[PDB]
Amino acid sequence: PLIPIVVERGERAYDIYSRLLRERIVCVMGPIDDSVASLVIAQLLFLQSESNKKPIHMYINSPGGVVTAGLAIYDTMQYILNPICTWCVGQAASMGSLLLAAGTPGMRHSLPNSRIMIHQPIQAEEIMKLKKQLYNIYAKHTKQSLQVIESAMERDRYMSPMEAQEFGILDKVLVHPP
Amino acid sequence: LIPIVVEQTGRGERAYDIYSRLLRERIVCVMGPIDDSVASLVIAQLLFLQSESNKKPIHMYINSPGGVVTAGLAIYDTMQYILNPICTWCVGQAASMGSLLLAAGTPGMRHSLPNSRIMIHQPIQAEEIMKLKKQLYNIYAKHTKQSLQVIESAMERDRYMSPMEAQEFGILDKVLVHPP
Amino acid sequence: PLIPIVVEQTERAYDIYSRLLRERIVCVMGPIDDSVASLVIAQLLFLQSESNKKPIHMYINSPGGVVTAGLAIYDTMQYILNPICTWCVGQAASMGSLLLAAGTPGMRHSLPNSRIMIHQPIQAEEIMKLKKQLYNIYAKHTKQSLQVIESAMERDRYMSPMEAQEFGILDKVLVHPP
Amino acid sequence: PLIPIVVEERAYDIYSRLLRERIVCVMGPIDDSVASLVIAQLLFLQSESNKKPIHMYINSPGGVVTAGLAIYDTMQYILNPICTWCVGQAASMGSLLLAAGTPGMRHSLPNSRIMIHQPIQAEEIMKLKKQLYNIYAKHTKQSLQVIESAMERDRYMSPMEAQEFGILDKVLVHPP
Amino acid sequence: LIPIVYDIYSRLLRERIVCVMGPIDDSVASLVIAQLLFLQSESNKKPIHMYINSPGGVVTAGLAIYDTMQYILNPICTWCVGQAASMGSLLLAAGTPGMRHSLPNSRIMIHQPIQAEEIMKLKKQLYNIYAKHTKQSLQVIESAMERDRYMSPMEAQEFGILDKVLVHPP
Amino acid sequence: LIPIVYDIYSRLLRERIVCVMGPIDDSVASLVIAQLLFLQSESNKKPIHMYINSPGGVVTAGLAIYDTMQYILNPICTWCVGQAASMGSLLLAAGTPGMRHSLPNSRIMIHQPIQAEEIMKLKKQLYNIYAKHTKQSLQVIESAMERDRYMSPMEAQEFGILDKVLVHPP
Amino acid sequence: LIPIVYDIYSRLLRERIVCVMGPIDDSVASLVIAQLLFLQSESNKKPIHMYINSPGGVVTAGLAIYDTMQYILNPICTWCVGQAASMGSLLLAAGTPGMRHSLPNSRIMIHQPIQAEEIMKLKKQLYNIYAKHTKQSLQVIESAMERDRYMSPMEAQEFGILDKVLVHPP
Amino acid sequence: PLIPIVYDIYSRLLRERIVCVMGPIDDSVASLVIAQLLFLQSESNKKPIHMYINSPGGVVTAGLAIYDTMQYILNPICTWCVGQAASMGSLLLAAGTPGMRHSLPNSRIMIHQPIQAEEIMKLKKQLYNIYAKHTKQSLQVIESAMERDRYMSPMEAQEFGILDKVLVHPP
Amino acid sequence: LIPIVVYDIYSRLLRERIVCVMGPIDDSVASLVIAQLLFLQSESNKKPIHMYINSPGGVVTAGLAIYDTMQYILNPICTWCVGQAASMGSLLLAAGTPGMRHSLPNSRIMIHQPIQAEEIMKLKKQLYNIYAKHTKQSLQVIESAMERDRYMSPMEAQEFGILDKVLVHPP
Ligand SMILES: CC[C@H](C)[C@H]1C(=O)N(Cc2cccc3ccccc23)C[C@@H]2N(C(=O)NCc3ccc(Br)cc3)CCC(=O)N12
Ligand SMILES: CC[C@H](C)[C@H]1C(=O)N(Cc2cccc3ccccc23)C[C@@H]2N(C(=O)NCc3ccc(Br)cc3)CCC(=O)N12
Ligand SMILES: CC[C@H](C)[C@H]1C(=O)N(Cc2cccc3ccccc23)C[C@@H]2N(C(=O)NCc3ccc(Br)cc3)CCC(=O)N12
Ligand SMILES: CC[C@H](C)[C@H]1C(=O)N(Cc2cccc3ccccc23)C[C@@H]2N(C(=O)NCc3ccc(Br)cc3)CCC(=O)N12
Ligand SMILES: CC[C@H](C)[C@H]1C(=O)N(Cc2cccc3ccccc23)C[C@@H]2N(C(=O)NCc3ccc(Br)cc3)CCC(=O)N12
Ligand SMILES: CC[C@H](C)[C@H]1C(=O)N(Cc2cccc3ccccc23)C[C@@H]2N(C(=O)NCc3ccc(Br)cc3)CCC(=O)N12
Ligand SMILES: CC[C@H](C)[C@H]1C(=O)N(Cc2cccc3ccccc23)C[C@@H]2N(C(=O)NCc3ccc(Br)cc3)CCC(=O)N12
Ligand SMILES: CC[C@H](C)[C@H]1C(=O)N(Cc2cccc3ccccc23)C[C@@H]2N(C(=O)NCc3ccc(Br)cc3)CCC(=O)N12
Ligand SMILES: CC[C@H](C)[C@H]1C(=O)N(Cc2cccc3ccccc23)C[C@@H]2N(C(=O)NCc3ccc(Br)cc3)CCC(=O)N12
Ligand SMILES: [Mg+2]
Ligand SMILES: [Mg+2]
Ligand SMILES: [Mg+2]
Ligand SMILES: [Mg+2]
Ligand SMILES: [Mg+2]
Ligand SMILES: [Mg+2]
Ligand SMILES: [Mg+2]
Ligand SMILES: [Mg+2]
Ligand SMILES: [Mg+2]
Numbered sequence A: 001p002l003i004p005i006v007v008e009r010g011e012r013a014y015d016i017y018s019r020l021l022r023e024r025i026v027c028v029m030g031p032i033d034d035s036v037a038s039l040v041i042a043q044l045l046f047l048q049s050e051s052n053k054k055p056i057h058m059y060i061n062s063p064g065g066v067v068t069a070g071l072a073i074y075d076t077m078q079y080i081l082n083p084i085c086t087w088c089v090g091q092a093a094s095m096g097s098l099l100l101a102a103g104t105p106g107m108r109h110s111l112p113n114s115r116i117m118i119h120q121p122i123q124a125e126e127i128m129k130l131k132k133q134l135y136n137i138y139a140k141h142t143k144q145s146l147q148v149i150e151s152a153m154e155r156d157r158y159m160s161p162m163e164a165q166e167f168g169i170l171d172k173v174l175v176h177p178p
Numbered sequence B: 001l002i003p004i005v006v007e008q009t010g011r012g013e014r015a016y017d018i019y020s021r022l023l024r025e026r027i028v029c030v031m032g033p034i035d036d037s038v039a040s041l042v043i044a045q046l047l048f049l050q051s052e053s054n055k056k057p058i059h060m061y062i063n064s065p066g067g068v069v070t071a072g073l074a075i076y077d078t079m080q081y082i083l084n085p086i087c088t089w090c091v092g093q094a095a096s097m098g099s100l101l102l103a104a105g106t107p108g109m110r111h112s113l114p115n116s117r118i119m120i121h122q123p124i125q126a127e128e129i130m131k132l133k134k135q136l137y138n139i140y141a142k143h144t145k146q147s148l149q150v151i152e153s154a155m156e157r158d159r160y161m162s163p164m165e166a167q168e169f170g171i172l173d174k175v176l177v178h179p180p
Numbered sequence C: 001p002l003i004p005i006v007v008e009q010t011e012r013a014y015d016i017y018s019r020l021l022r023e024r025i026v027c028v029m030g031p032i033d034d035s036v037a038s039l040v041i042a043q044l045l046f047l048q049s050e051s052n053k054k055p056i057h058m059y060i061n062s063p064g065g066v067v068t069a070g071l072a073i074y075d076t077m078q079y080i081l082n083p084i085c086t087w088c089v090g091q092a093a094s095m096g097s098l099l100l101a102a103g104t105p106g107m108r109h110s111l112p113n114s115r116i117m118i119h120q121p122i123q124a125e126e127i128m129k130l131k132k133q134l135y136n137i138y139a140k141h142t143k144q145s146l147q148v149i150e151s152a153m154e155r156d157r158y159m160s161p162m163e164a165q166e167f168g169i170l171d172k173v174l175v176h177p178p
Numbered sequence D: 001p002l003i004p005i006v007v008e009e010r011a012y013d014i015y016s017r018l019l020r021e022r023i024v025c026v027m028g029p030i031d032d033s034v035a036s037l038v039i040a041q042l043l044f045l046q047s048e049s050n051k052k053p054i055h056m057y058i059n060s061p062g063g064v065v066t067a068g069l070a071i072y073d074t075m076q077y078i079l080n081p082i083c084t085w086c087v088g089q090a091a092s093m094g095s096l097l098l099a100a101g102t103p104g105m106r107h108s109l110p111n112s113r114i115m116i117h118q119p120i121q122a123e124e125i126m127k128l129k130k131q132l133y134n135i136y137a138k139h140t141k142q143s144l145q146v147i148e149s150a151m152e153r154d155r156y157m158s159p160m161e162a163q164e165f166g167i168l169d170k171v172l173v174h175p176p
Numbered sequence E, F, G: 001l002i003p004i005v006y007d008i009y010s011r012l013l014r015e016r017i018v019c020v021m022g023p024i025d026d027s028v029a030s031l032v033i034a035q036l037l038f039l040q041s042e043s044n045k046k047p048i049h050m051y052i053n054s055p056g057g058v059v060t061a062g063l064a065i066y067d068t069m070q071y072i073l074n075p076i077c078t079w080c081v082g083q084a085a086s087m088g089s090l091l092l093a094a095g096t097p098g099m100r101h102s103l104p105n106s107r108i109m110i111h112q113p114i115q116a117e118e119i120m121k122l123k124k125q126l127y128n129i130y131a132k133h134t135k136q137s138l139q140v141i142e143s144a145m146e147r148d149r150y151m152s153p154m155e156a157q158e159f160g161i162l163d164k165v166l167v168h169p170p
Numbered sequence H: 001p002l003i004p005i006v007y008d009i010y011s012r013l014l015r016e017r018i019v020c021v022m023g024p025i026d027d028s029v030a031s032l033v034i035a036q037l038l039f040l041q042s043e044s045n046k047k048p049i050h051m052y053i054n055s056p057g058g059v060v061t062a063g064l065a066i067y068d069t070m071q072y073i074l075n076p077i078c079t080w081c082v083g084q085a086a087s088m089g090s091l092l093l094a095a096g097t098p099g100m101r102h103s104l105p106n107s108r109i110m111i112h113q114p115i116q117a118e119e120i121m122k123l124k125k126q127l128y129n130i131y132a133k134h135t136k137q138s139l140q141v142i143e144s145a146m147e148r149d150r151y152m153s154p155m156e157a158q159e160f161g162i163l164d165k166v167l168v169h170p171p
Numbered sequence I: 001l002i003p004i005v006v007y008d009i010y011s012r013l014l015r016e017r018i019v020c021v022m023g024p025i026d027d028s029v030a031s032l033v034i035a036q037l038l039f040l041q042s043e044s045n046k047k048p049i050h051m052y053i054n055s056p057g058g059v060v061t062a063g064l065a066i067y068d069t070m071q072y073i074l075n076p077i078c079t080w081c082v083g084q085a086a087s088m089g090s091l092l093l094a095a096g097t098p099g100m101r102h103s104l105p106n107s108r109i110m111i112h113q114p115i116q117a118e119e120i121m122k123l124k125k126q127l128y129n130i131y132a133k134h135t136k137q138s139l140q141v142i143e144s145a146m147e148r149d150r151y152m153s154p155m156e157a158q159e160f161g162i163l164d165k166v167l168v169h170p171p
Helices: A016-022 A034-050 A067-079 A095-101 A124-142 A146-153 A161-167 B018-024 B036-052 B069-081 B097-103 B126-144 B148-155 B163-169 C016-022 C034-050 C067-079 C095-101 C124-142 C146-153 C161-167 D014-020 D032-047 D065-077 D093-099 D122-140 D144-151 D159-165 E008-014 E026-042 E059-071 E087-093 E116-134 E138-145 E153-159 F008-014 F026-042 F059-071 F087-093 F116-134 F138-146 F153-159 G008-013 G026-042 G059-071 G087-093 G116-134 G138-145 G153-159 H009-015 H027-043 H060-072 H088-094 H117-135 H139-146 H154-160 I009-014 I027-043 I060-072 I088-094 I117-135 I139-146 I154-158
Strands: A005-007 A013-015 A025-029 A056-062 A084-093 A108-110 A115-117 B004-008 B013-017 B027-031 B058-064 B086-095 B110-112 B117-119 C005-008 C012-015 C025-029 C056-062 C084-093 C108-110 C115-117 D005-007 D011-013 D023-027 D054-060 D082-091 D106-108 D113-115 E017-021 E048-054 E076-085 E100-102 E107-109 F017-021 F048-054 F076-085 F100-102 F107-109 G017-021 G048-054 G076-085 G100-102 G107-109 H018-022 H049-055 H077-086 H101-103 H108-110 I018-022 I049-055 I077-086 I101-103 I108-110
Touching: A005 A016, A005 B013, A005 B018, A013 A016, A016 A025, A016 A034, A016 B036, A016 C005, A025 A034, A025 B036, A034 A056, A034 A067, A034 C016, A034 C025, A034 C056, A034 C084, A056 A095, A056 B036, A056 B069, A067 A095, A067 A124, A067 C056, A067 C084, A084 A095, A084 B036, A084 B069, A095 A108, A095 A115, A095 A124, A108 A161, A124 A146, A124 F116, B004 B018, B013 B018, B018 B027, B018 B036, B027 B036, B036 B058, B036 B069, B058 B097, B069 B097, B069 B126, B086 B097, B097 B110, B097 B117, B097 B126, B110 B163, B117 B163, B126 B148, B126 E116, C005 C016, C012 C016, C012 D005, C016 C025, C016 C034, C016 D005, C025 C034, C034 C056, C034 C067, C034 D014, C034 D023, C034 D054, C034 D082, C056 C095, C067 C095, C067 C124, C067 D054, C067 D082, C084 C095, C095 C108, C095 C115, C095 C124, C108 C161, C115 C161, C124 C146, C124 H117, D005 D014, D011 D014, D014 D023, D014 D032, D023 D032, D032 D054, D032 D065, D054 D093, D065 D093, D065 D122, D082 D093, D093 D106, D093 D113, D093 D122, D106 D159, D113 D159, D122 D144, D122 I117, E008 E017, E008 E026, E008 F026, E017 E026, E017 F026, E026 E048, E026 E059, E026 G008, E026 G017, E026 G048, E026 G076, E048 E087, E048 F026, E048 F059, E059 E087, E059 E116, E059 G048, E059 G076, E076 E087, E076 F026, E076 F059, E087 E100, E087 E107, E087 E116, E100 E153, E107 E153, E116 E138, F008 F017, F008 F026, F008 H027, F017 F026, F017 H027, F026 F048, F026 F059, F048 F087, F048 H027, F048 H060, F059 F087, F059 F116, F076 F087, F076 H027, F076 H060, F087 F100, F087 F107, F087 F116, F100 F153, F107 F153, F116 F138, G008 G017, G008 G026, G017 G026, G026 G048, G026 G059, G048 G087, G059 G087, G059 G116, G076 G087, G087 G100, G087 G107, G087 G116, G100 G153, G107 G153, G116 G138, H009 H018, H009 H027, H009 I027, H018 H027, H018 I027, H027 H049, H027 H060, H049 H088, H049 I027, H049 I060, H060 H088, H060 H117, H077 H088, H077 I027, H077 I060, H088 H101, H088 H108, H088 H117, H101 H154, H108 H154, H108 I117, H117 H139, I009 I018, I009 I027, I018 I027, I027 I049, I027 I060, I049 I088, I060 I088, I060 I117, I077 I088, I088 I101, I088 I108, I088 I117, I101 I154, I108 I154, I117 I139
Parallel strands: A025 A056, A056 A084, A084 A108, A084 A115, B027 B058, B058 B086, B086 B110, B086 B117, C025 C056, C056 C084, C084 C108, C084 C115, D023 D054, D054 D082, D082 D106, D082 D113, E017 E048, E048 E076, E076 E100, E076 E107, F017 F048, F048 F076, F076 F100, F076 F107, G017 G048, G048 G076, G076 G100, G076 G107, H018 H049, H049 H077, H077 H101, H077 H108, I018 I049, I049 I077, I077 I101, I077 I108
Antiparallel strands: A005 A013, B004 B013, C005 C012, D005 D011
C-alpha cells in the first residue's frame, strides 16, 4: 500500500490523506480501535480549530470495532460545535453505523450500494451496560423507541441505504451530487 | 523499490514516486486484490482528480483478480458519483470485482489490451450474501445492457473471457493493440 | 497507520500529533509501558519549559498498563508545577483511571459515554506494596478513605462518568464546551 | 510508537531535544545496544560543556551486566557531574547506575521502586557478582557484607529506604 | 485421558447412547452415522439415545446425520445437555416425536452463525426441516432464525423443538 | 504419563470417585457426565465422590455437569482440594447437603473471571443456582460474585458453599 | 476417539460397507482400494456398500478408486449422504447401475474446483467417465461441469448420476 | 518419552508404596500424586509411604492440594529429597512424618518462592504457617528466611527443621 | 520404532541389569535411572549393575540425584562409556565402583562443564569434590583441568582417574 503524493501562496506537496484532511474530510476506514479513535479525534479537534462552523466530512467504510473506541469518536463528534456530514461508502456495520447515525441531522449520507448494520457481532453486567449505552445512542439519533432498537439490533442483517434512511440512521441516498 | 521521477511544476522541479507521477496524468491504478485499503485510496484519488477538473477524463488502470465486494462497490459507487468520464483499461486481467469496475467505465471508453483475461464469475448470513449477489447482477446488467437471466447464467460459469468475448458481451467497448 | 500532516501559520507543517503537542495536549492512549511513560514524561518536561503556568491537557484513553510506568507518569504530573487538565475519552481503566484522577482538582474531565475502572486486572510482598501505593494515591486524589478505596477496587466493574464524579475521580462530565 | 517533533527555529524529535537539555535516558532493558547509545551520548555531552551537569533518566528493570558496567565505567570516566533520576523503577543494573551518580546528585521521585537484587562459566559469573558488590559498596559507602546480604533478598526498597541505604541522596516531590 | 471400565465412550455405546459433542464436521458425522447403523443392526426397535452438546458445525455434515436419523427405523431420543445451537438444535428437534428432551439449564439456538445460490439453498433446506419437526410455518421459522438469541428449554418446548424438560428421570 | 495399578484414574472410578480437574470444557463435561451415568447404573444408592480441583471453565459445560448431578438419584459428595473457582465452586456447592467437603488449605471463588443479553441470561442462571444451594438471597450472591477474591474453606462453609472442612477423617 | 464394539469402522467393514470420507488423497485411495480387495476376497458376488460424503480431492487418487471399483466383479452400492462433490460425485456415479443412492438432503456437484496439457488430459478422462456412467453426451458433460453449482438428489438422478433418492428403506 | 517395562516401571515402583513428586508441580501432578496416596492408603493405612521428591516447585494450590492430602491420610509418610526440593517441593519435603524426612548428601533445598494482590499474599501466609508448623520455627524466622534467594545444604535444612536425616548409605 | 524381543528391547536390557543414561540428563531422565537402580537392587543387592553412558551432560541437580543414588545402593556398579561422557556424564562414569569403570576405545570424555551466582558456585565446588574423591586427584588438579575446554581419550582418562579399563574386546 503506497500512498500517493499530490501537489496543491505557492505549491505544497501532501500525501493524499493529508490533502484529504485539508478538504475537511476525516476517514474512518476498517476496524475501529483506540489508535483509529485517537487519530480521528485529533483530526476533529484540528478541523474545529481551523473553523468551528465550516462542515466536517466523515468518510465511513468500517465493519465496526472496539466499543469504547467508537464511543470515544461519538462523544467527540457531539462535543465539537461543527456540523458533521457522515458518508457511508462500502459499508457501515456495528460501531460504524453508530458513527454514521451520529452525524448532524440532515447531513447523514450513503451511496447507493452501501450496506448498513446496527447488529453487533470484561464482566457480564459490564458488557450489558455498554449494550444499553448503544441502545440509547441509536434511539436518540434514529428517533425510534428503545423497543424498536433492541428488537432491530437482535436481527443479524444488513440494511440497504433506503431502509436505513427510513429507519432513521441516515438522511440522504445520493447517486450523484445535487 | 519504487523509482523517483522529476517533473517541472512551474517555478521549479518536483520529485515524485512514479505512481504519484501517474496520478498527475489522471490515471488511477486498481491492481491486485481489492480491500478497504485499496478502495479508500482509489476513492481519494477519484475525488482529487475531479477537483482538479470535473470534465477531463480519468484513466482507470485495472489489473486485479477481484476482492472484497463492499470495497469494490465503494469504488463503483464513487465512479458513478463523480462527474468525470472514466476510461477503464484492462491490462493483465480483470476478474470478479475487477471486471465490475472495468464494465463500469463511461460507455465507449472501456478498453482492454489484446491478451487480457476477463471474468465475471465470483470465486455473514445467507440472505445477506444473496443480496450482495443480487446487487452484482443488477450492476452487471446495467452496464453490459444484458438481461438478468443472461448475467446470472454467465456468472454461474467458472471461466474467463477474451477481450473480444468481453466486448461482445458488453463489459468493454474497445480492444486496442496500439493507441488510435 | 498513516499519520496526517497539518499546516500552521507561523507556514510550518507537522504531523498531527506534534501539532497536538503545540496545543499543550499530551496523549495517553492504549496500554501504558515504559516506552509510553518516557514519551509522556518527555512531553510534560517540554511543555513545562515552554511555560510553567499555562495548563497542560492530558488526553486519556487507556485500558491501563505497567504499574511502575504508570507511577512514573503520576510522579511527573505531581512534580511539574503546571495545572494539568485530564480528559477521559473512551475509557480510563486501571492505571489509566489513576492518571485521570491525578489531574489538578477542578480540572478533571470526562465525556459522557466514557467508562472508568479503578479495579486492577515480583515477589508476593512486593506485589502488595504496589497495591498499597495505589490505594494511597487513589485515596489522596479521590479524597476517600483507604477502606472505601480498597473495597471499591475489589469490585470488577466500570463506572459511568457521573458515578466517577461522585466517587471523586473526576470533577466534570461535559457534553459540549461551556 | 510515533515520536513527536518539537521546535526550539529548529525542529527535532523530542528525544533529540531532550539530549540538548543534557538529559540521557536509560530506558527499558540494558543491552550492548543501549550501552553504546548511552556511552556515545555521555562522551558527546562532556565535550559540549564547561562541566555542566548531565542528567541520567533511569527507568530500567536491569539487563546484561557487561553492558551495565560499560555505562558505569563511562560515567566514572567522564569527568562531569552526573545527576541520576530514578522514575518508575531502577532494578538490577539500573540501580547500580542510579547509585553511581555524583554524590549529592542522586535523585528519585516519590513512588519509584529500587532493587539491588539481581534476578559464561561459574567462576566467571561469580567474578562479575563481586564486581557488582565492590561498586555498590563504594557508592553506598556500606560494607561488602551489608551489600552481599541485601542483594540476597528479592525485594524492592522505597526511595526513602534507598536514601538511607546510600543508593540515592534526595527524594523530591517537587523541584526545590 | 479417557477412563476404562471398554473405554467409557465405547461402554456408553453398549447402552445405546450416541454422543454428538462439540463442533460437527464430516468426521463427527461419519462417526455418528456409523454408530446409528450399528445400533440399528443390533435392534431396529430398541430406542437410541442421542446425547447432544454441540455449538453447531458444517451444514452438510449436520444434514448427513439428520438424513440418517430419518433413514433408520429406530425411535431416537434426543437429549440436550449444555447446549444445542445451529445444526445441534436441528438434530435435537429431529428426534422421534414425544422423545425430545432437555435438561433444565440447557441453551437452544436455531439461529445460524460455496456460491451464494448454494448457501441459500442450504438455508431453505434448514427452514423446511425445522418447519417439519416443530410444526411451525416457514415464516415463523425464517423470522425466528433471524434473531441472534438462545431460548430456554421451556421456550424451545413451546416452539416445538423439544417435548420434555426433565429435572429427574420419569 | 499415568501409572496403572487399570490406569489409576480408571481405578479411582471403581471407588466411585470422579475427577473434575483443571479447566472445564465440553470434553471434560462429557467425560464427567458419562462417569456419573455409569456409577449410578452400578448403584443408585451408594454415594459418588466428586473430586474438584478446577479454576472454572465454560459455563454451558459446567451447567451440563450441574444438571446431570441433580438429574441422577445418587447422593454426591463434593471434595474441594486445591481450589474450586468459577464453575468449579458451583459444582462444589451443588453436592448433596451435608456432604460438601473441603480440605483445610483450599481456595474457593464464586466470582467469574455470544451476545450481551445472552451473557447476562447465563449470569442470572448462575445467580439462581448459587442462591438455591447456598440458601442465600439473590442480592447477597450478586454482590459477592462482583468481588474478585477467594474464600477460605471455613469462610465458604459460612457462606453456604460447603458443609465440612476436614483435616483428617472423622 | 473411535469407539470399540473391534473398532466401529472395522465392524462396519464386516458389513461390507466402505467409507469414502473427507478429502480424497493417495492415503484414502490406498485404504479404500485395500478394503475393496478384501471384501471381494470374502465374496466376489455379495454387494459392497460405498458410503460417500466427500468434497473431492486428488484426481489420480480418485481415479485409482474408480478403476478399482470397475476392476472388482462385485456389485457396489454407492450412497451419497451429506455431499458428493468433484471426485466424490464421480465415485457416486460409478456405482453399478440401479444401485446408486442418495439421501434426501445431500448435495451433488460434478463441477471441479502438473503442466497444462496434463491437466486437460485428466479433465477429458473425467468427461469420459462421467459420460459413460451418465449416459449423457460429452457436450452435455463439459457444459454442466463448467457450471459452479450443486444439484439436488432428484436433479442428480435425472441427470444420470444416481438411481434412487430414499428417505427410508423401501 | 520411552519408559521401560518390568507393568510400567513407575507403576511397579508404586507397588512398593513409593510415589514420585517429579519436576514442576501443576494440577495434573497434584491429582496423580493424590490418586496414588489414596490408593496406597487403601492397601494398608499403616505401612509407610515413600515420597520421592525432585522438584523445582510449581503451582501453590496444586502443592497445597498434595500437602492437605498428606496430612489427611492416616499413613506415616517418608519424604526423600534427591536432586533438589525448591519452593512447594521443599514444603512437601518438610511435611513428611516427623523423624522420616530424608535427603541424600548432594541435594539442594530452597524455601524461597521464585490472581489479585491480596490473594497472592493470603497464599504466602498459608505457606508461612505450614513451614512454621513442620519446621517448628517462629513465623518471623520463616518469613525472614524465605525472603533470602538461596539454597540450603541437606545439613543446613536438617538444622533448620525441614528434614530429619541426611543419609549417604542405608542404616 | 522400538523393537520387541523374545517385551521391548530396552526392557530386556534392564533385565540384563543394564541401565542406560543416554543423551541429555534432566530431572525426567534421572528419576527413571534412579527407578531402575532401586529396582535392580531389590532383585539383588550384590549382583553388579551395568550403567551404559552415552551422554553430553545435562542438569547438575539431576546428575547429582543419580550420583547420590549410585552411592546409596549397595550394589557394585560397572560404568561403560561408549560414544562420549561429557559434563555430568563423565562424573557418573567416574562414580562407578573402583576397578569397574570402563570405556570402549573411541569414546570421548570431558570433565569441563559447558539460579543465582553464589549457588552456581556451590554446585561447582560440589562437582570438584565429587570428581576429586573418585579421581584421587587434588582439588587444584580438578579445578585446573575442568577449566580447559577439551576432551580426553579413554587412555588419557584412565590415567587421570576417571576410569579403570579401556577394552577393545572383553577379557
Ligand atoms: C472542542 C475543544 C475545546 C476548544 C477545548 C477542549 O475542551 N480541549 C480538551 C481536550 C483535549 C484532548 C482531547 C479532547 C477530546 C475531546 C474533547 C476535549 C479534548 C482542548 C481543546 N484545544 C483545541 O482544540 N486546540 C486547537 C487544536 C487542536 C488540535 C490540533 Br492538531 C490543532 C489545534 C486546546 C484549546 C481548547 O480550548 N480546547
Ligand atoms: C464528488 C464529491 C462532492 C464534490 C463533495 C462530496 O460529496 N463530498 C463527500 C464525500 C466525503 C468523503 C468521501 C466521499 C466519497 C464519495 C462521495 C463523496 C464523499 C466531499 C467532496 N469534496 C471534494 O471532493 N473536495 C476536493 C478534494 C478531494 C480530495 C482531495 Br485528496 C483533494 C481535493 C469536498 C467538497 C465537496 O463538495 N465534495
Ligand atoms: C520539572 C523538571 C525540572 C525543571 C528539572 C529537573 O528536575 N530535571 C531532572 C529530570 C530529568 C529527566 C527526567 C525527569 C523526570 C521528572 C523529573 C525530573 C527529571 C531536568 C529538568 N530540565 C528541563 O525540563 N529542561 C527543559 C526541557 C526539557 C525537555 C525538553 Br524535550 C525540552 C526542554 C532540565 C533543567 C531542569 O532544571 N529540570
Ligand atoms: C572523556 C573522553 C576523552 C576526553 C577522550 C577519550 O578518552 N576518548 C576515548 C574513547 C574512544 C572511544 C570510546 C570511548 C568510550 C569511553 C571512553 C573513552 C572512549 C575519546 C574522547 N572523545 C570525545 O569525547 N569527543 C567528543 C564527542 C564525543 C562524541 C560525540 Br557524538 C561528539 C563529540 C574524543 C576526544 C577525546 O579526547 N576523548
Ligand atoms: C438402514 C440400513 C439398511 C437396512 C441398509 C442400507 O440402506 N445401507 C446403506 C448405507 C451404507 C452406508 C452408509 C449409510 C448411511 C445412511 C443410510 C444408509 C447407508 C446399509 C445397511 N446395512 C446395515 O445396516 N448392516 C448392519 C450394521 C451396520 C453397521 C454396523 Br458398525 C454394524 C452392523 C447393510 C445391509 C443393508 O441392507 N443396509
Ligand atoms: C440417570 C439417567 C437415566 C437412568 C436414563 C436417561 O435419562 N438417559 C438419557 C441420557 C442419555 C445420554 C446422556 C444423558 C445425560 C444426562 C441425563 C440423561 C442422559 C440414559 C440413561 N441410561 C443409563 O444411564 N445407562 C447406564 C450406563 C450409562 C453410562 C455408562 Br458408561 C454405563 C451404563 C440408559 C438407560 C436409561 O434409562 N437412562
Ligand atoms: C485378479 C484380481 C484379484 C484382485 C487379484 C489381483 O489382481 N491382485 C493384483 C492387485 C494388487 C494390488 C492392488 C490391486 C488393485 C487393483 C487390482 C489388482 C491389484 C491381487 C489380488 N489379490 C487378492 O485380492 N487377495 C485377496 C485379499 C485381498 C486383500 C485383502 Br486385505 C485380503 C485378501 C491377491 C491375489 C489375486 O489374485 N488378486
Ligand atoms: C476416610 C478415608 C478415605 C480417604 C475416604 C475419603 O475421605 N474420601 C474422600 C476423597 C475423595 C476424593 C478425593 C479425595 C482427596 C483427598 C482426600 C479425600 C478425598 C474418599 C476415600 N476413598 C478411598 O480412598 N478408596 C480407596 C482407593 C482410592 C483410590 C484408588 Br486409585 C484406589 C483405592 C473412597 C472411600 C472413602 O471412605 N474415602
Ligand atoms: C534401604 C534401601 C532402599 C533404597 C530403601 C530406601 O531407602 N527407599 C527410599 C527411597 C525412596 C524413593 C527414592 C529413593 C532414591 C534413592 C534412595 C532412596 C529412595 C525406598 C527403598 N525401597 C525399595 O528399593 N524397593 C525395591 C524396589 C524399588 C523399585 C522397584 Br521398580 C522395584 C523394587 C522401598 C523399601 C526400602 O526399604 N527402600
Ligand atoms: Mg456536533
Ligand atoms: Mg461518472
Ligand atoms: Mg502538578
Ligand atoms: Mg561523579
Ligand atoms: Mg426416527
Ligand atoms: Mg441428585
Ligand atoms: Mg464392477
Ligand atoms: Mg499423615
Ligand atoms: Mg555403590
